[PDB]
């Protein structure tokens, strides 16, 4: 059966090569390159007293949740820099945080192997744990709310899960990754999500069916960060091999490679601009690099963190970019 | 500011004060990453000090230790090992009576110790090495020689020399002048491993403080 698997993989790569008529670089040589994305730190969110592993923007593009090793889940008013909530986590070993699109809930998790769901809007003025999602046998590396009752989580146990928050049970388990899964990115329609894993592969998952629609293998090291293109027809991965890659869902192939020789460190976080022409990647070299997604040119650099940029997010209105980093700071950029 | 804006700012300031107080409380913690390989004495020394990550909290001689046990994380260690980059010390458990066992156990622990010693996040992190089950090792060393594990041993088959050879082989992979490896022999019946950890941690703090002044 191993021979059949090898034959099927050869057929898949030949089918990808057949559709690879013109590269994304070749087609995009006739579009105007964006000059220089010289964004500036509008806000500095101070208050985290340890490394920040995760931030997530609210859909209002004003609130954001950050997760730090200090055992605190802080919700920020990114406009006024106010702290809306300081959620103390039972496990301080958090590596992911999600903000529910409704705004009623945040999720977080990490080495405790639990996605903890926090109700931000209770009759009591405190934020408390609505649900602790247990069932992952590895650390949770990413979590994303589908809605108020559904959240998809990735884990170091090589699986992703879809949960019913009310019942607390895994509605679906997404197996197939052979390495630990670092990241998830939900599609805009939330019918399907991509996950990157330590097997250097990105898998496309159908949320309703629970099956791996496509598998993307371009990276040679662990994929730490994954992000959908704004239309949901493409996604960008970020791995430890110092490169970012753009994969098309329909073409089922890698389109663009975002690497520079003077960048040798790994990539912790990726995000797209609202139009998707900018790919913003956070690196271990302490700074975020802005990439022309269509042309793979470094459009800018978000230097300004004194440690590894571990997370970053673009607002839904596209106004701002937040960068969290291991230096315990979140920076809002414009 | 609006009245509501002023009260929101007041709430933010109260939050910041609580965060500062919590961080001040947390900075007094001695964080220890407990490591080992299965059948070593990890659980034994956790019981002596006294889900995916187990936190052991103990206070010894006015020093509060947070012992982080990551054994149940059967994952890629490098993906979360940086989460403990700031531990005072790694407490590494080796089963002495694992040279004659295979699952080779002692080579597995030796390679794990090498990887932890020379990990980039732990280049200057000292290690409290525990060589557990020294009584089982002494019982197994009079019958079985230390040749199944180490062929190039070429040494006496006595308990003292064999244990010292194992400890030397474990210390040989430090390759760092900043960090120290504090080795101890344990038997799961001894009740002084809390003192061993405390003494090693005080030595680590003293050495770091000397290093700051230029005296180390």
């Amino acid at each position: 059966l191993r021979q059949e698997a090898e034959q099927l993989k050869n057929q898949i790569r030949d089918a990808r090569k057949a559709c690879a008529d013109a590269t994304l670089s070749q087609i995009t040589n006739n579009i105007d390159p964006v000059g220089r994305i010289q964004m500036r730190t509008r806000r500095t969110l101070r208050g985290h007293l340890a490394k920040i592993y995760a931030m997530h923007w609210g859909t209002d593009s004003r609130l954001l949740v950050s997760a730090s090793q200090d055992g605190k889940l802080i919700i920020w008013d990114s406009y006024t820099t106010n702290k809306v909530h300081a959620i103390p986590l039972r496990s301080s070993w958090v590596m992911t945080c999600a903000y529910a699109p409704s705004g009623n809930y945040v999720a977080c998790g990490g080495l405790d192997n639990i996605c903890s769901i926090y109700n931000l809007k209770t009759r009591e003025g405190n934020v408390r744990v609505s649900r602790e999602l247990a069932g992952h046998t590895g650390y949770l590396s990413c979590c994303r709310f589908l809605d108020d009752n559904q959240i998809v989580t990735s884990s170091g146990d090589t699986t992703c899960a879809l949960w019913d928050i009310e019942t607390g049970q895994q509605t679906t388990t997404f197996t197939g990754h052979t390495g630990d899964v670092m990241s998830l990115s939900l599609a805009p329609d939330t019918r399907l999500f991509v996950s990157g894993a330590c097997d250097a592969s990105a898998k496309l998952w159908d949320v309703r069916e629970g099956m791996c629609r496509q598998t993307f293998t371009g990276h040679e090291s662990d994929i730490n960060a994954i992000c959908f293109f704004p239309n949901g027809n493409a996604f960008a991965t970020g791995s430890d091999d110092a490169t970012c890659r753009l994969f098309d869902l329909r073409a089922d192939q890698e389109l663009m490679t975002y690497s520079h020789d003077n960048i040798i460190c790994g990539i912790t976080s990726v995000s797209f601009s609202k139009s998707g022409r900018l790919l913003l990647a956070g690196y271990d070299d302490f700074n975020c690099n802005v990439w022309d997604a269509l042309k793979a040119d470094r459009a800018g650099v978000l230097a300004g963190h004194d440690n590894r940029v571990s997370c970053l997010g673009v607002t839904d209105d596209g106004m701002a970019v937040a960068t969290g980093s291991w230096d315990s700071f979140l920076k809002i950029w414009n | 500011l609006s009245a509501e804006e002023r009260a929101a700012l007041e709430r933010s300031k109260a939050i910041e004060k609580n965060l500062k107080e919590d961080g001040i409380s947390a900075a007094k913690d001695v964080k220890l990453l407990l490591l080992g390989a299965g059948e070593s004495g990890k659980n034994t020394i956790v019981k002596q000090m006294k889900t995916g990550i187990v936190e052991t909290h103990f206070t010894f001689k006015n020093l509060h230790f947070r012992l982080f046990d990551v054994g149940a994380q059967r994952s890629e260690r490098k993906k979360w090992i940086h989460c403990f980059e700031d531990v005072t010390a790694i407490i590494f458990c080796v089963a002495l009576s694992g040279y004659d066992q295979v699952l080779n156990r002692m080579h597995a622990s030796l390679k794990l110790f090498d990887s932890i010693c020379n990990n980039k996040f732990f280049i200057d992190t000292s290690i409290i090495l525990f060589l557990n089950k020294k009584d089982l090792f002494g019982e197994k060393i009079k019958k079985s020689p230390l040749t199944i594990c180490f062929p190039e041993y070429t040494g006496p088959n006595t308990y003292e020399d064999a244990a010292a050879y194992i400890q030397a082989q474990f210390e040989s992979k430090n390759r760092s002048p900043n960090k120290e490896i504090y080795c101890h022999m344990t038997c799961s019946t001894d009740t002084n491993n809390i003192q061993v950890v405390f003494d090693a941690v005080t030595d680590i703090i003293i050495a770091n403080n000397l290093r700051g002044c230029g005296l180390y």
Partner: single-chain antibody
Amino acid sequence: VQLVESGGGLVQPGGSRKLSCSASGFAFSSFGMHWVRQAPEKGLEWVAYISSGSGTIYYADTVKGRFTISRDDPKNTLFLQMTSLRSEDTAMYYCVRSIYYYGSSPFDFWGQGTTLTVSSSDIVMTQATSSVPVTPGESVSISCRSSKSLLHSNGNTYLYWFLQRPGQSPQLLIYRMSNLASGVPDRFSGSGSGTAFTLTISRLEAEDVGVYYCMQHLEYPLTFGAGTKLEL
């Protein structure tokens, strides 16, 4: 979530009493706390404010220096020490829950209140309509006026809508103009601009009968409109 006030009763003029409110069922220490009184026939009148953490205290200009507000966060109790109790101090005093952060709904929960009986630059909030006649199923638009633009440069319009149903506590309907409070059906609506605001009830039921109150929260001389009573 409940707020139970104690104290009250007949008091000689110029005397002193101390109203308390025994909060329970919510994170009392994280809420700012108000006293809002109401004469037996008149509208709501804000008394005083103690913020969460006690760092900020405000008083009504007509009570400042006389009344004293204090909270007991470990005891979950809010106090109002009253001195030199005038005849104007006869009213039902309501303890009002209130929390302030981005998106919060202040004035969302009100206590039952206690009656205190005494024997012998502020923004003007105007709602002239009173005793409006209604029938179930009809759409009514309660109007409200402000002496100063309630809109702030942050975009918020700090006008509140409360429903004082007969014999019970005021209940928040619209917290910041056009923001519907939790537990309030989406037949109530808030709208306005600048200084003029309207509370629209799409299809009113017999429960929607009561006295509807304005309240500005921009500067912090909290002033109410003269209640717009709706009756069947």
